[PDB]
Design a protein around this ligand. Structure first.
Ligand SMILES: Cc1cc2nc3c(=O)[nH]c(=O)nc-3n(C[C@H](O)[C@H](O)[C@H](O)COP(=O)(O)OP(=O)(O)OC[C@H]3O[C@@H](n4cnc5c(N)ncnc54)[C@H](O)[C@@H]3O)c2cc1C
Ligand SMILES: OC[C@H]1O[C@H](O)[C@H](O)[C@@H](O)[C@@H]1O
Length: 458
């Protein structure tokens, strides 16, 4: 079913992995590419967003097909599934609501498209071209800030918030329309790989293909072992490069099972603590758009105010005090529904995490009162894992120091040719939506590969 060898093997079909296919497809048009996705194809084109399926019955089945092994408070959103066990532990908080997606497009086939920029200490210092890669991350995702201009309440919502937020802040950190990847139509991975990949003769996308191991020969990326999930037979596909973009949890799971077990892999896992709140405007689906209250080092929260349109939703996301004991561990002795080392989350909020969390509750209420009439009296704190923004599992670093898993170009240290993509590549304590940053990092690695493929003599 699969070829024998390719120039580049891509594990996963999320937005970051499809960015590698994108830049490679349009920058290295000659190389051969094999993208292997465990989950099925649930949209058209592959990776399209489910919200774009008109029929609400075709959309539900498209969602349950993405819930992987969970195809049968603590529950997951449609298109996602939770862990069987090992999420919470005694003496720790854990991520009871940490979810995943198994389908062509990844979670990019279910997200809400928010794509803000990092500010202050969110931005990655050792990247002097971050602003350039960020704009390319805009291009690939089809980001737009003017998706809700005619919207009647988007302007009023932004006005009331600015009166309570804009004091003393520079223009980049004032209230503004959230940059959205809205392609009335949502952007998935279908928009990232796009036509360049979809019309690339040397690119092939294999759903129902489980990558159970990254092959390495001579200490260098040698390929991948792919298990055809429709025949149960295990193949082996060679390649000069291997891109692993299977999300911040399963990516370290694949490397750990592959023998690539650096002491840093899976550690410094950080989740954005989410705080929900609602308010009712005072007056008389394009109706309100999305409002962005940027992050700042002095208020390490990220603010989303969306049209759910008199009633608006308020969510605040917290950057975390990164620690080593925040780690995704793996047990060889116990497999999971896919047959890989069962994972286990060691996650605990430090006192600094709570000092910020309760600050988010005080501030989201201030924002709720600024916009109008608060519904509930008290803001509700979502359990760890709800944000679905897991960073640091394969964090990036400027040099090798036992706490970075890859290089600034996403190239895993002890395994040349193996690149990692996704939220886990982020190393800094962030509060905004990472996907735009994850695509920016993925674009930097992809065009590092295209640089080497087209400049080599092989
Ligand atoms: C409801 C919802 C709303 C969201 N809203 C936002 C938002 O507004 N802004 C934002 O920034 N983010 C948002 N997110 C999160 C966003 O989707 C992720 O940040 C992003 O999709 C990460 O992309 P990725 O490619 O790194 O990983 P993913 O998109 O998760 O891709 C991982 C893929 O790899 C596959 N895979 C895993 N292991 C293997 C294997 N061994 N072999 C083969 N394939 C494998 C999986 O099946 C999956 O398809 C939202 C998520 C949800 C669920
Ligand atoms: O509950 C819906 C929410 O789900 C997730 O937490 C997303 O981060 C947010 O964008 C979305 O509105």
């Amino acid at each position: 079913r699969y070829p024998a060898a390719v120039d580049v093997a891509i594990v996963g079909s999320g937005p970051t992995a499809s960015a590698y296919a994108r830049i490679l497809s349009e920058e290295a048009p000659g190389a051969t590419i094999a993208m292997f996705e465990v989950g099925p194809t649930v949209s058209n084109p592959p990776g399209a967003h489910v919200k774009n399926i008109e029929d609400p019955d075709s959309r539900s089945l498209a969602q349950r097909a993405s819930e992987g092994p969970g195809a049968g408070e603590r529950r997951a959103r449609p298109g996602t599934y939770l862990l069987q066990d090992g999420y919470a532990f005694p003496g720790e908080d854990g991520m009871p609501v940490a979810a995943m997606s198994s389908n062509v497009g990844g979670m990019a086939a279910h997200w809400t498209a928010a794509c803000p920029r990092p500010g202050g200490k969110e931005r990655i210092p050792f990247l002097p071209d971050l602003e350039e890669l960020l704009n390319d991350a805009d291009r690939l995702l089809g980001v737009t800030t003017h998706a809700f201009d005619g919207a009647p309440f988007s302007d009023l919502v932004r006005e009331r918030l600015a009166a309570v937020v804009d004091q003393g802040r520079t223009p980049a950190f004032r209230v503004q329309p959230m940059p959205l990847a809205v392609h009335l139509v949502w952007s998935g991975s279908d928009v990232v790989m796009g036509e360049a990949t979809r019309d690339n003769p040397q690119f092939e996308l294999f759903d129902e293909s489980l990558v159970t191991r990254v092959l390495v020969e001579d200490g260098t990326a040698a390929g991948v072992e792919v298990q055809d999930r429709r025949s149960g037979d295990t193949y082996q596909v060679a390649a000069r490069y291997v891109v692993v973009g299977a999300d911040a949890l399963r990516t370290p799971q694949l490397l750990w099972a592959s023998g690539i077990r650096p002491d840093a892999l899976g550690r410094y896992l950080n989740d954005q603590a989410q705080v929900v709140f609602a308010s009712r405007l005072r007056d008389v689906s394009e109706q309100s758009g999305v409002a962005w209250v940027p992050y700042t080092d002095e208020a390490p929260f990220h603010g989303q105010i969306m049209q759910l349109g008199s009633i608006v939703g308020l969510g605040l996301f917290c950057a975390k005090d990164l620690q080593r004991e925040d780690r995704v561990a793996f047990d060889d002795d116990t497999r999971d529904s896919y047959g890989l080392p069962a994972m286990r989350i060691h996650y605990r909020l430090t006192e600094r995490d709570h000092v910020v969390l309760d600050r988010a509750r005080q501030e989201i209420v201030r924002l709720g009162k600024a916009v109008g009439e608060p519904l509930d009296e008290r803001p509700f704190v979502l359990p760890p894992g709800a944000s679905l923004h897991y960073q640091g599992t394969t964090r990036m670093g400027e040099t090798d120091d036992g706490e970075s898993v890859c290089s600034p170009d996403s190239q895993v240290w002890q395994v040349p040719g193996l690149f990692v993509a996704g939220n886990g590549v982020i190393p800094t304590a962030t509060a905004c939506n990472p996907t735009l940053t994850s695509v920016a990092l993925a674009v930097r690695g992809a065009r590092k590969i295209a640089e080497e493929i087209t400049s080599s003599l092989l």
